[PDB]
Structure 1
């Protein structure tokens, strides 16, 4: 009956000390007559006792969805500690365990290139600015466009794709009106990854 789902922190969260990276253990499909769900958290095998279990919430399909949220230290996540959520409930034969961590393997620093649009992309009102980020590991990364300090709206990012040698690459596309690229605005592609200095770099682009 009950299914357990264990979610990692957001990459922008693990990479900036101002933010609060958290692991979330989500139990769904808990019957009405065995609703008491117990949680235990282990960090690299030692039980931790500081997780905040939000009070159960009855779903419209007549099952309880219960959530528990453990906060993690940024150096704990990035040093490769394993997080074991252990969910016990009297609807279960025996308790369910789920574990989560950063990806094993040595970090690799992404190279960041910014490509300008094709000449064939001038006969349009809109134009595509491209940012290639390649050779990074593990694949937790964050890509963001801006110009003149303010963020950009119209950008899309592919998912991280596996190259032959084990590392990852992706592309981010910023659609801008040809006018602004003509005028000469500078657009910037900002990349946040653990293997970067200050965890952040930025590449700029203009006519």
Structure 2
């Protein structure tokens, strides 16, 4: 007398940065968990607005810590298609299911709203430390899909962390990104840049600079 149950399916969108730059390759990922030794064969079919496509790749399966298998199929999507709201369906067939599971994903719906991007210098109080925080406030944006980076002198600055998007009171999203730098790099007048990728920006990109004033 065995508990009723079979595999489960999770379907994931591309990464925002991959969607926003035509040079990258965005993918949707269909993940099947709890595949047993008893019914191990999994079949994927994929559809884009209802039309079957044949270019997905299945990854070699992986036995998980709990002696079930995780099986993953990845489908490359076209830049324009994902951004223009096409719907991507993964159908998963397996003998432990009473019928195939179908999951559909697309870009978030709703009118896109342009990020406003503000750079904020360190608080005067923080200038007593050895490292200072440079802040990038990105607000007013929709949908919540966004990428934020920092750079200085044309090189990526990687000592930053960015908050998740947070839903604001008017339906849009905001976040903050914090770049930590050595105080002397600030005090010497180095220019830092916060760059934002979002679909409601012109060319999907903008950047704002932050530096200690001269003189």
TM-score by length of 1: 0.96
Deviations along 1:28-65, one digit per CA (max 9) or x if unpaired, are: 11111211111111212222222112233333432221
| Matched length | 207
Q: Aligned to 1:55, what secondary structure does the other structure show? A: coil
- 2:36 is aligned with 1:13: no
User: Which residue matches 1:54?
Assistant: 59
Give the whole-Å Cα distance in 2 for the aligned partners of 1:22 and 1:50: 11
Larger displacement relative to structure 2 (10-19 or 57-66): 57-66
Give the whole-Å Cα distance in 1 for the aligned partners of 2:104 and 2:71: 18
Aligned structure 1 segments of 4 or more residues deviating by more than 4 angstroms: none
The gaps in structure 1 that reach 5 residues or longer are: none
**Deviation at residue 117 of structure 1 after TM alignment:** 1.2
Give the whole-Å Cα distance in 2 for the aligned partners of 1:159 and 1:66: 28
CA RMSD of aligned residues (A): 1.1
**Deviation at residue 206 of structure 1 after TM alignment:** 0.5
Larger displacement relative to structure 2 (47-56 or 191-200): 47-56
The gaps in structure 2 that reach 5 residues or longer are: 1-5
Deviations along 1:85-135, one digit per CA (max 9) or x if unpaired, are: 111100111111111111101111111110111111111111111111111
Q: 1:139 aligns with which of 135, 144, 168?
A: 144
- 2:161 is aligned with 1:148: no
Give the whole-Å Cα distance in 1 for the aligned partners of 2:183 and 2:198: 30
